[PDB]
Write a protein that binds this ligand. Structure first.
Ligand SMILES: [Ca+2]
Lengths: 227, 228
C-alpha cells in the first residue's frame, strides 16, 4: 500500500533551434515540468572528459590529437548518458543529432524519439541577438547593445574599460553559421519526415513560434506534447 | 501492483565546497545517479528571471536596480524552484544557504535536509586551481598555467593574441574568497551540528577528500550517502 509510484510513459525529445532562438531556456522549462534529463552536447562532452571513464579517456585522446569527434562516437556517448538513472522518465536531446549519420546511429543504437520540437525564430531577430553582444574581457561582464546596454557605449559600467565583440559574434560569421544551421536542420527534418525504420519509432515533428513571451512559447510547446 | 513501485523518501542535500574544489562536477554525478535536481544559485536566478513568472519579474527588477538579493528573497526563489516536478525525488542545493539567516529561513519553510556534503581540498591546491587560469577574451578559449598550458606563455594557441588573467582570479582576491568561504562554512556546519529546531531534522554532515580522482571522489560520496 506504499507501492504508489507509477512510471509514466517515456517523454523523449530532440530539441532544435538556431543560435539566439532561446531553446536553452525552453529546455530547462521542459525538464523541470516533465521531470526528464536535459542532455546538451557541450555539457555531456565536458562531463565525459572529467569522468576518467574509458569513454572519457578515448575522447580526451581524440581532442588532444586535434581530430574532431566522430558521429558514431558522440552517439556512443549519448547512449551511455541516457542509461543513467536521471533518464528514467525520458530525456531531451539538445545538440544531437546534428547530422544524418548521427540520427542513423541513434536508430541503430535503438534510441527511440517521441518528438522533434523546433523553436523557430526569424533570421533577423536571431542576427540581432548575437551581433549585439558585448563583453568586458577582464571581468567577463556581459552587455547587449539593444537588450542590456552599458551606461556609456562600448565601455564597462564598473571600470570604464572598453568592451569588445567576441570574434564569432561578428555579423558575417553569424549569418554564415546561421545558414549552415538552417541547411543542416532542413536535412534532419526531412530525414525524420521520411523516417522509415524497423529498430525505432517515427518521431512527431513540432514547429514552435519562438517569437512570443517565454511563458507563451512554453505553453505552445506544452499544448503540442499533450496532443 | 502493476508497474507500481515503492514511494521512496526524497533525498535532500546541501553541497559545500570552495572555489576550485570541483563540487560542480560531483553535483552532476550525484544528480545523474540519484535522480534528484541539482539546484545551483546562479542558474536558478538566471532561469527565474527568463521565466516571466511574477516572482521572476520582481527578481529581475531587484537585479536591474543593481541591488542585492536578500537572504529572504533567495530562499523565496528556492521555495519556487523546489516546487517543480523535477524536485519531487529530492534535490541538491549548491550555493545556498550561505548564511545563517538563509539556513533559518530554509528551516522555517519546512525543508528537511538529509545530508551536508563538503568536498574538502587543501587551500594550496584550491588557490593554484584558480590563479593559473588564463583566457583569450576574443574567442573565450581558456587555458591553465599548470593543468592545460598554452603552447607559448601568455599567448593563444590558435591566433597568437595575448591571454589575460580574469580580475577576480588574482591571488589576493582568491585568498580573500577562500577565507570567507571557510568562515561561512564553519558557521554553517556549527549551525547544523547544534541544530535544535522543532520544524526540521538534524542533517548528517559528511566531509569528503576531494583531492582524489573524480570517480574515487564520487564513490566516497556514494559510500557515505548510502549508509543506513
Ligand atoms: Ca529527474
Amino acid at each position: 500500500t506504499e507501492n504508489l509510484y507509477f512510471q509514466s510513459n517515456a517523454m523523449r525529445i530532440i530539441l532544435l533551434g538556431a543560435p539566439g532562438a532561446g531553446k536553452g531556456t525552453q529546455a530547462k522549462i521542459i525538464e523541470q515540468k516533465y521531470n526528464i534529463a536535459h542532455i546538451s552536447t557541450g555539457d555531456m562532452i565536458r562531463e565525459t572528459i572529467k569522468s576518467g571513464s574509458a569513454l572519457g579517456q578515448e575522447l580526451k585522446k581524440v581532442l588532444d590529437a586535434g581530430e574532431l569527434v566522430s558521429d558514431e562516437f558522440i552517439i556512443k556517448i549519448v547512449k551511455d548518458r541516457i542509461s543513467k538513472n536521471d533518464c528514467n522518465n525520458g530525456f531531451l536531446l539538445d545538440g544531437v543529432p546534428r547530422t544524418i549519420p548521427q540520427a542513423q546511429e541513434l536508430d541503430k543504437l535503438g534510441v527511440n524519439i517521441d518528438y522533434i520540437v523546433e523553436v523557430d525564430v526569424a533570421d533577423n531577430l536571431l542576427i540581432e541577438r548575437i551581433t549585439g553582444r558585448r563583453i568586458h574581457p577582464a571581468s567577463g561582464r556581459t552587455y547587449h547593445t539593444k537588450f542590456n546596454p552599458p551606461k556609456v557605449a562600448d565601455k564597462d559600467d564598473v571600470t570604464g574599460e572598453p568592451l569588445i565583440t567576441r570574434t564569432d559574434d561578428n555579423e558575417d560569421t553569424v549569418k554564415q553559421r546561421l545558414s549552415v544551421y538552417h541547411a543542416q536542420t532542413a536535412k534532419l527534418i526531412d530525414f525524420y519526415r521520411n523516417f522509415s525504420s524497423t529498430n525505432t519509432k517515427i518521431p512527431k515533428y513540432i514547429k514552435i513560434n519562438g517569437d512570443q513571451a517565454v511563458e507563451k512559447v512554453s505553453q505552445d510547446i506544452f499544448d503540442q506534447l499533450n496532443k
